[PDB]
Amino acid sequence: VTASIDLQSVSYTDLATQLNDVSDFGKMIILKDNGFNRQVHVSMDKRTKIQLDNENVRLFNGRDKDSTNFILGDEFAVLRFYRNGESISYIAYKEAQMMNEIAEFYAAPFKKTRAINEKEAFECIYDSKYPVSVKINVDKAKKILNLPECDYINDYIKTPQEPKTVYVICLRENGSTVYPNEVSAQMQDAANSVYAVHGLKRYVNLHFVLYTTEYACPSGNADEGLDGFTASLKANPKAEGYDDQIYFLIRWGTWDNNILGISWLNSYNVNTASDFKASGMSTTQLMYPGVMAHELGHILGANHADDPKDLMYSKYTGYLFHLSEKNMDIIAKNLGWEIADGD
Amino acid sequence: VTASIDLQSVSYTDLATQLNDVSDFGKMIILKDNGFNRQVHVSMDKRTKIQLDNENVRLFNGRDKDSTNFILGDEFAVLRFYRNGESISYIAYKEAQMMNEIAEFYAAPFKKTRAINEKEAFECIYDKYPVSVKINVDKAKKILNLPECDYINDYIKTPQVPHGITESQTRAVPSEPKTVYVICLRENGSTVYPNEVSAQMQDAANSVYAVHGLKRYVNLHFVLYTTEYACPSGNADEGLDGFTASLKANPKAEGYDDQIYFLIRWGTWDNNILGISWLNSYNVNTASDFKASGMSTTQLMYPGVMAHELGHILGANHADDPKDLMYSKYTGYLFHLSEKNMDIIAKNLGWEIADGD
Numbered sequence: 001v002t003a004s005i006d007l008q009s010v011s012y013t014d015l016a017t018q019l020n021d022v023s024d025f026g027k028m029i030i031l032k033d034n035g036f037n038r039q040v041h042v043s044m045d046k047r048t049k050i051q052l053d054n055e056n057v058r059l060f061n062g063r064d065k066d067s068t069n070f071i072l073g074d075e076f077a078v079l080r081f082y083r084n085g086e087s088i089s090y091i092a093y094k095e096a097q098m099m100n101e102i103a104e105f106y107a108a109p110f111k112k113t114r115a116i117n118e119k120e121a122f123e124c125i126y127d128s129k130y131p132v133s134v135k136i137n138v139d140k141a142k143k144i145l146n147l148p149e150c151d152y153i154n155d156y157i158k159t160p161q162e163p164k165t166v167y168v169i170c171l172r173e174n175g176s177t178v179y180p181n182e183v184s185a186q187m188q189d190a191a192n193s194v195y196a197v198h199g200l201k202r203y204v205n206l207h208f209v210l211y212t213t214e215y216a217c218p219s220g221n222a223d224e225g226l227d228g229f230t231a232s233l234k235a236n237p238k239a240e241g242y243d244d245q246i247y248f249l250i251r252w253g254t255w256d257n258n259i260l261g262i263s264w265l266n267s268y269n270v271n272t273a274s275d276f277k278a279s280g281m282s283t284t285q286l287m288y289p290g291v292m293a294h295e296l297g298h299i300l301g302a303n304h305a306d307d308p309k310d311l312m313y314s315k316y317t318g319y320l321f322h323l324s325e326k327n328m329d330i331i332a333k334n335l336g337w338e339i340a341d342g343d
Numbered sequence: 344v345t346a347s348i349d350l351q352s353v354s355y356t357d358l359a360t361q362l363n364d365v366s367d368f369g370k371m372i373i374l375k376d377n378g379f380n381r382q383v384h385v386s387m388d389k390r391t392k393i394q395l396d397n398e399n400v401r402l403f404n405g406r407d408k409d410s411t412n413f414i415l416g417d418e419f420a421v422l423r424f425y426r427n428g429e430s431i432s433y434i435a436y437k438e439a440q441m442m443n444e445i446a447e448f449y450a451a452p453f454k455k456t457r458a459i460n461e462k463e464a465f466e467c468i469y470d471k472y473p474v475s476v477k478i479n480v481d482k483a484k485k486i487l488n489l490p491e492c493d494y495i496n497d498y499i500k501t502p503q504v505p506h507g508i509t510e511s512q513t514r515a516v517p518s519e520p521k522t523v524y525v526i527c528l529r530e531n532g533s534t535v536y537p538n539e540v541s542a543q544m545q546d547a548a549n550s551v552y553a554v555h556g557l558k559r560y561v562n563l564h565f566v567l568y569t570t571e572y573a574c575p576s577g578n579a580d581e582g583l584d585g586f587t588a589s590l591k592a593n594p595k596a597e598g599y600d601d602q603i604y605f606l607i608r609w610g611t612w613d614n615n616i617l618g619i620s621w622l623n624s625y626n627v628n629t630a631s632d633f634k635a636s637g638m639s640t641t642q643l644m645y646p647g648v649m650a651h652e653l654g655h656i657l658g659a660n661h662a663d664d665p666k667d668l669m670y671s672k673y674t675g676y677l678f679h680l681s682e683k684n685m686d687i688i689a690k691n692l693g694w695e696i697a698d699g700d
């Protein structure tokens with residue numbers, strides 16, 4: 001009787017019909033696979049709004065113990081959950097042509113490395129022929145692909161010395177190609193890393209938007225890229241009136257020295273936000289979840305943390321939450337929180 | 344400065360950027376049309392869900408005094424408001440090709456009748472290709488001189504069976520409104536336009552919630568798919584009979600016999616019939632066997648037909664007031680005014696007088 005999603009044949013329509021049935025009180029949905037079951041209580045994420053080129057994207061959460069999130073647009077749907085400490089994504093596009101392109105895109109890196117246990121890292125899912133979704137275990141995929149080390153060393157810069165709606169204006173770099181499932185996952189992880197700190201949904205509701213910009217980084221250098229990006233925002237007449245919002249230049253790839261992203265440190269405060277100061281750049285590739293979250297952390301004042309399980313660790317470790325109490329207090333205070341308010 | 348929509352150049356992106364900014368607390372938006380200005384307080388409609396072929400469509404309302412509604416999908420947006428008692432829609436599609444097709448579609452009937460005030464009935468809005476169309480349906484029907492499409496006896500009493508009358512258990516306001524799907528099926532061979540279908544669905548849902556605080560009891564979820572069924576003739580009674588039979592014989596519809604169904608098309612049936620339904624065929628406790636079914640036109644020029652047929656499905660009879668949605672002749676009004684009809688509809692959705700409004 002309880003609604004279920006069969007991960008051996010999950011398509012866009014399966015995910016859409018289930019998620020579109022989720023009311024304001026949530027819905028129990030059983031995730032099923034061979035040897036797997038999980039009963040998740042799914043609710044609409046009412047804190048975050050997303051448009052990708054004006055396409056509305058809705059987020060859904062499980063309970064904390066469910067370790068499950070979803071993304072739903074008209075063109076694609078994502079189910080992401082943790083199982084035995086690994087993050088697994090089911091990515092399903094509605095259109096056959098786009099689904100085939102996405103499947104080829106994710107399958108391609110596994111062509112040169114046709115090592116054992118490929119299905120556990122990546123699998124094309126078919127109707128119970130062309131795929132209806134792809135399964136990617138990012139933890140297993142990175143072990144098989146043996147990708148070069150990407151990190152956050154010196155990925156920040158400083159300038160010299162009702163919840164509030166805050167727009168996070170993401171701009172697709174000129175000449176870059178980004179995928180909606182990948183961009184929205186970065187946005188969801190970025191928003192959830194903020195709300196997990198000091199009950200911050202009471203103070204802020206993040207509204208992500210994605211457009212294309214004519215700006216392109218003049219070189220592979222991230223510092224120069226960010227200096228040029230912030231300058232392009234100040235010189236854009238169409239951005240006038242939105243200098244107090246947060247901005248990200250996004251791309252699929254990375255910068256020189258495998259830098260995943262970069263941002264102006266401690267550049268956003270709800271009372272003094274101005275002059276496009278709260279800006280950064282971020283990769284959006286699937287294999288590096290949490291980069292936008294890490295850069296958004298720096299924009300909100302978080303410094304690098306000493307714990308290897310912290311989102312703000314200087315090395316890329318795949319963790320998506322702030323653990324540093326000092327960072328948590330800095331971020332929350334920049335969003336209007338004070339200790340007397342509690343969590 | 345207060346947000347505004349300039350109706351002299353309103354595009355899909357104008358409507359989408361404004362409506363997507365509407366938070367839980369609503370937003371003031373000034374509608375501007377040269378010297379005309381209306382401040383509307385817009386809020387998200389959280390009572391109704393809509394998918395058209397799995398495309399999510401969100402509804403927005405103004406305050407009661409604003410007389411304004413909006414529709415937003417990824418592909419299109421609609422602003423509909425009343426001006427001097429006339430229903431005016433601004434319809435904007437995102438894609439240039441689709442906007443051009445929609446503009447040509449709505450302009451075409453006016454090519455055989457060039458009126459002096461054609462702009463007051465229909466206008467392509469620019470800023471070389473239109474960004475939206477303005478249609479004043481009341482003025483458009485006067486210029487186009489369409490045949491008087493009516494309801495006549497647009498209902499069939501739902502069949503009954505002899506049975507000992509069981510006591511009705513007095514129920515309470517549910518802790519959560521009951522989700523009732525309104526499964527709309529695009530008739531085989533019919534073409535329907537998303538802005539038109541969603542306007543019929545919005546008017547249908549709003550006609551129910553306006554009665555006895557019914558959003559406490561029901562949250563309507565409209566969905567649209569295509570069916571292989573097509574009416575075997577122009578006759579609406581025979582078409583409805585065949586449609587309900589096609590639902591019962593469809594293995595894919597098994598398990599959803601207790602929901603509400605509409606066969607939708609763009610056109611009408613014989614004798615200018617706009618739609619037809621099984622009268623008093625939906626009750627939240629006894630809904631079954633696809634009984635709660637009807638058929639409806641979705642063309643823009645007949646707003647409220649789906650609302651009228653949904654009224655009959657929920658038990659409403661024809662009303663004597665020409666301003667009632669349930670008047671026996673099509674009059675363009677979108678709300679139930681008959682207290683008898685209101686009580687019948689609300690009782691079929693779980694309401695009782697002790698619950699109040």
Ligand code: PRO
Pocket residue numbers: 011012013014093094095096099131132
């Ligand atoms: O729309 C869906 O769910 C999938 C996509 C390819 C064909 N069927």
Ligand code: PRO
Pocket residue numbers: 007032033036083088119120135137
């Ligand atoms: O086998 C896999 O890759 C994942 C684990 C849970 C469901 N499917």
Ligand code: PRO
Pocket residue numbers: 009010011013014126127128132
């Ligand atoms: O293949 C199946 O069983 C389901 C139906 C749509 C795609 N997944």
Ligand code: PRO
Pocket residue numbers: 173174175176177216251252253254
């Ligand atoms: O998507 C990318 O990674 C490319 C790199 C330079 C500009 N954009």
Ligand code: PRO
Pocket residue numbers: 266267268269272300301334
């Ligand atoms: O931009 C910021 O984050 C700092 C914090 C206090 C006010 N300005």
Ligand code: PRO
Pocket residue numbers: 354355356357436437438439442473474
């Ligand atoms: O809404 C927009 O921006 C474009 C302009 C015409 C078609 N859609």
Ligand code: PRO
Pocket residue numbers: 495671672
């Ligand atoms: O004169 C009237 O109003 C009647 C009502 C149904 C058809 N014409």
Ligand SMILES: [Mg+2]
Pocket residue numbers: 074075417418
């Ligand atoms: Mg679309």
Ligand SMILES: [Zn+2]
Pocket residue numbers: 152153155156294298304314
């Ligand atoms: Zn960093």
Ligand SMILES: [Zn+2]
Pocket residue numbers: 494496497498651655661669670671
């Ligand atoms: Zn009638």
